[PDB]
């Protein structure tokens, strides 16, 4: 089958910008039949081109398409706020006919680095009494989205049992905010006394440790 | 012709 | 005006069947294509296939001929996707659409026509798991010791989704509820956060409304060091 390759996978833009997405084909563009797609969260895909470079009905002005070779190529000439969403390319082809996607670009709002406010929360006692001790570090209102979160029980670096949840981009200012929560047993909180994060980020000057000790 | 016959004649057509 | 209406969301065991349904309005159902896309949670659009509305044939994606049956009712202008023996891999929105096919010549070819979906339904969620409506724990996330963090962990509920709101709404500034994750317990957990003065943390109060519609449980607590 044909893959579609959407490079990159996030597009850091400013609103305002002028915005390219790239659809990179294993063959030849014009040899399929190609659209277009935007998608944002919680909806349908909304069709924006269709072929090389005809408008949808209802589609702003400001989107145009463009294939030569294996490139076919979205253009937005003024990124609105509403434009900032995930495009899908579209390529209907091949022997065994099939509708292939490419894996999608996700254009983000590129603002100034941020570093993130670190916290980190001891398991409550509500949910100690439950038999299970959930420990979280709470990186706030950073960018870019890269951090490196490490967890320390001890200073033994802890691997398997966190979970890590980023929000959307805040509509405000543009920031993400991520959770790492360390998950352990009632039991294995106990016998540990010094919990500890430690983050690592594009805006800070050198990584922030955020730990509490148990019972203090 | 129903633009489906279309489509199905050009799925016949990508199989050559 | 054209549009399409599909069935509401599905909470299926594995090894269960679904059916899901794409009604047709404001155009002839018998005259366009519909394709079946699907979307896993984080993931891309998966072409399941298409169903000629026009014959009930239906074509099936390379990796889609076995558990996945496309059927049509012109009657009710309605398509259908029933899936069989669902999988937790199953687990995903499913997306109707209507295919359009047009262009000039006398045989359709990518020089010279068009292939697109111009209209789509809203989705249909299916959520394939082998755990029971649970609703959530709430426990909180106490401030520490010129900003504070607080927050609340909505832990262990089935299915998504949990709503969570701060001083009911009042409190909107500061708040991020992160996306729910699924636990190796088959159960969803997210924490919800604000960011307040430090000096209102004996002065104003904070409490988390969570919303879990699926099991109509619905808690205030109250967060404080
Ligand atoms: C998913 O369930 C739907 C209904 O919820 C199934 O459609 C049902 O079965 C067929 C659909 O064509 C309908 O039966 C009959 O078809 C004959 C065709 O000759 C017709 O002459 C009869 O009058 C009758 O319509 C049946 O009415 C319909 N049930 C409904 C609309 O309630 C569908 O088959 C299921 N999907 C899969 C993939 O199995
Ligand atoms: C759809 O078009 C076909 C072919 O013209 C016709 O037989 C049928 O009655 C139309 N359906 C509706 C609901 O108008």
Known sequence: ?216 | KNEQELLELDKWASLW | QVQLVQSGSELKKPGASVNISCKASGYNFTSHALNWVRQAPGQGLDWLGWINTNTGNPTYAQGFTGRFVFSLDTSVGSAYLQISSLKAEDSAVYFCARVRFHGSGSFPQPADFYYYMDVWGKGTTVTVSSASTKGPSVFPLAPSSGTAALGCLVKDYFPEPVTVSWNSGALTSGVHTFPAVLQSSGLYSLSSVVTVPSSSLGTQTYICNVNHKPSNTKVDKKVEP
């Open chain 1, 1 to 216: 089958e044909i893959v579609l390759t959407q490079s990159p996978g996030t597009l850091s833009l400013s609103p305002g910008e002028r915005g390219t997405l790239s659809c990179r084909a294993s063959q030849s563009v014009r040899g399929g039949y190609l659209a277009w797609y935007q998608q944002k969260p919680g909806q349908a895909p909304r069709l924006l081109i269709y072929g090389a470079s005809s408008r949808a009905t209802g589609i702003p002005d400001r989107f145009s398409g463009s294939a030569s070779g294996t490139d076919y190529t979205l253009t937005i000439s003024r990124l609105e706020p509403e434009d900032f969403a995930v495009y899908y390319c579209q390529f209907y082809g091949g022997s065994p006919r099939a509708l292939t996607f490419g894996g999608g670009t996700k254009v983000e709002i590129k603002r100034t680095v941020a570093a993130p406010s670190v916290f980190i929360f001891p398991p409550s006692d509500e949910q100690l009494k439950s038999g299970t001790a959930s420990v979280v570090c709470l990186l706030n209102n950073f960018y870019p989205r890269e951090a490196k979160v490490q967890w320390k029980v001890d200073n033994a670096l802890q691997s398997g049992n966190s979970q890590e949840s980023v929000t959307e981009q805040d509509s405000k200012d543009s920031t993400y905010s991520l959770s790492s929560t360390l998950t352990l047993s009632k039991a294995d909180y106990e016998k540990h006394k010094v919990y500890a994060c430690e983050v690592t980020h594009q805006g800070l000057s050198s990584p922030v440790t955020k730990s509490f000790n148990r019972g203090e």
